[PDB]
Ligand binder design. Structure first.
Ligand SMILES: Nc1nc2c(ncn2[C@@H]2O[C@H](COP(=O)(O)OP(=O)(O)CP(=O)(O)O)[C@@H](O)[C@H]2O)c(=O)[nH]1
Ligand SMILES: [Mn+2]
Ligand SMILES: [Mn+2]
Length: 603
């Protein structure tokens, strides 16, 4: 039977529910063969070899075991509009807005999703191998860890999951007969190929659909090989699906980096931060701090799962096993710890390649040796005179977290690390000071709710979760507010930052990167108990921020809070929240809108 198609592993070695899931989907998708992944190095080398032979990956000979994938340019990013959550009731998924369409997610009915599924998956893996990836989100064991099984027809997804999650036989052994999240993925190009293949990279942009069915604990993704769409444990499972589980179960799943910072007297605090795409999470999470005697260590750079412990501390774990980082802009100067991490055992996707088999991208800040030339991510000889970047702007590296030279010693502790501060922020060229602190938990929640970031357009992205809410955002806001009624809660201090304020010539007012350690110092000491009151929150008192070692900073413009700007600001925040959240907007947030307007009117 099915057994005849198994080219690695044994159906009999699978827990029955895992076997049933495989059986059902192999019948449906009709793969030519089945490969049960073991997660071993030998399997990995095997799959990289096969991918090299097929044109899927090229070896980057400048490094130890690094590889490059070039994709079809139509498949290079998440597609929000093609990403949906399916529930019986729309309101469980997104609030019904007052006007317009929701910008807080995209719901699809059970009925409509069945019709989409049936138009896509039957026979989709014909001519291909279906891989079975058992994976753990969180340390193989932890109270806070969840397991999934991802079936995929993409060896690129396999090797990337090996890095981004704990994967293989040991997870199946830990899972036993427990529950798991059912993850089904196909690139959507059964053989014989019906359309042209670009760069040997199969995709089906026209039918691409990334679906989440929380009541069935299933994630079903079709048409795209790109990481956000195909690495189902990460955005789909560890943010979307998990956020809903978290609300139902008394925990949180957030688009937050977690770092541990130590001062020159040995006192160490963990901080979590939510920033949208392009706003600097990875840079902060593995910061090399400029301030002497301080240290930063990385727990995670993208996703945090957080739950109150028995003494009321909000404990975080990083459910990922690796870093899926934006490559362009990464340099020894801007993120030397990232450059160090990616020197070996790394898969890059859509970056440029030098003639000595090195990588390259905008902002790498590394002059080429004599005679060395660049091949762009489109496989063309490239020069800076061509009018297009050598690397796609959202090109990535996918690298083992264990390789970060400052990876925190508790990054895999099953008890998690206690969060003392939560930081929000984004790109705001005007009006928003470098840093401010919320006035209370409810105000902090409002600060998160109110986030906006420049992407020439400025968009709302509350809690940096806009594309990732697994359920109604008004109920997510209520869930966060409810933390303040948790018995003996030790609530983290909330801050909002802006590394990106500009002067009138568009130049940054703050140098950023490692110098952001000065901002962290301020937060660290605020957590320990000074401040200047303003209508938007506390800012540092005059001279409180440590500027020793910097050239001149225009502190007055950087911390400027204009009534005109903020009148406009709160008017925009009100309109957005009342319109988009509507009947689901918690009263506490209403009070905060009004309270800020009241405070601003007094200036
Ligand atoms: N001016 C300035 N630019 C910064 C700072 N931090 C990061 N950047 C720029 O922001 C860009 C993106 O940074 P990155 O660390 O990848 O952001 P991210 O939040 O990790 C993105 P994703 O969630 O997809 O991984 C990079 O080009 C980086 O150089 C900073 O303090 N100042
Ligand atoms: Mn990142
Ligand atoms: Mn992210």
């Amino acid at each position: 039977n099915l057994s005849a198609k198994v080219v690695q592993g044994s159906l009999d070695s699978l827990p029955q529910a895992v076997r049933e899931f495989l059986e059902n989907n192999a019948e449906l998708c009709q793969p030519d063969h089945i490969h049960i992944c073991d997660g071993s190095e030998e399997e990995n080398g095997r799959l990289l070899g096969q991918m090299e032979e097929e044109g899927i990956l090229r070896r980057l000979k400048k490094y130890d075991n690094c590889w490059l994938a070039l994709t079809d340019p139509r498949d290079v990013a998440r597609i929000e509009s093609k990403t949906v959550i399916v529930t019986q009731e729309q309101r469980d998924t997104v609030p019904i807005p007052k006007t317009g369409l929701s910008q807080l997610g995209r719901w699809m009915s059970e009925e409509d999703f069945e019709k989409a599924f049936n138009a896509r998956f039957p026979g989709c893996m014909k001519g291909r191998t279906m891989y079975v990836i058992p994976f753990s989100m969180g340390p193989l064991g932890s109270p806070l860890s969840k397991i999934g099984i991802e079936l995929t027809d993409s060896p690129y997804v396999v090797a990337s999951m090996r890095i981004m999650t704990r994967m293989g036989t040991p997870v199946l052994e830990a899972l036993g007969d427990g529950e798991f999240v059912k993850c089904l993925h196909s690139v959507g190009c059964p053989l014989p190929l019906q359309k042209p293949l670009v760069n040997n990279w199969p995709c089906n942009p026209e039918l691409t659909l990334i679906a989440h069915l929380p009541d069935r604990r299933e994630i079903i993704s079709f048409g795209s090989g790109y990481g956000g769409n195909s690495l189902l444990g990460k955005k789909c499972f560890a943010l979307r699906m998990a956020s809903r589980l978290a609300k139902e179960e008394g925990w949180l799943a957030e688009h937050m980096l977690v770092l541990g910072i130590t001062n020159p007297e040995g006192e160490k605090k963990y901080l979590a931060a939510a920033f949208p795409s392009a706003c600097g999470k990875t840079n902060l999470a593995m910061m090399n701090p400029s301030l002497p005697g301080w240290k930063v260590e990385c727990v995670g750079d993208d996703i945090a799962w957080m739950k109150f412990d028995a003494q009321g501390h909000l404990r975080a774990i990083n459910p990922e096993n690796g870093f899926f980082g934006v490559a362009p802009g990464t340099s020894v100067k801007t993120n030397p710890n990232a450059i160090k991490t990616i020197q070996k055992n790394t898969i890059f996707t859509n970056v440029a390649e030098t003639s000595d088999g090195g990588v390259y991208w905008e902002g790498i800040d590394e002059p080429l040796a004599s005679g060395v030339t660049i091949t762009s991510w489109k496989n063309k000889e490239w020069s800076s005179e061509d009018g297009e970047p050598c690397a796609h702007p959202n090109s990535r590296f996918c690298t083992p977290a264990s390789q970060c030279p400052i990876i925190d010693a508790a990054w895999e502790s099953p008890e998690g690390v206690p969060i003392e501060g939560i930081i929000f922020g984004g790109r705001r060229p005007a009006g928003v000071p470098l840093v401010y602190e919320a006035l209370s938990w409810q105000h902090g929640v409002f600060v998160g709710a109110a986030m906006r970031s420049e992407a020439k357009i400025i968009m709302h992205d509350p809690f940096a979760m806009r594309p990732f809410f697994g359920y109604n955002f008004g109920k997510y806001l209520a869930h966060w507010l409810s933390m303040a009624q948790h018995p003996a809660a030790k609530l983290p201090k909330i801050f909002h930052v802006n590394w990106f304020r500009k002067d009138k010539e568009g130049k940054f007012l703050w140098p950023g990167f490692g110098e952001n350690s000065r901002v962290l110092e301020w937060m660290f000491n605020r957590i320990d108990g000074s401040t200047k009151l303003t209508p938007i929150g506390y800012i540092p008192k005059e001279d409180a921020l440590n500027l020793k070692g910097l050239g001149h900073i225009n502190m007055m413009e950087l911390f400027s809070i204009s009534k005109e700007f903020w009148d406009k600001e709160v008017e925009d925040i009100e309109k957005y929240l009342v319109d988009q959240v509507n009947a689901d907007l918690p009263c506490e947030i209403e009070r905060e809108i009004l309270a800020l307007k009241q405070r601003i009117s007094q200036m």
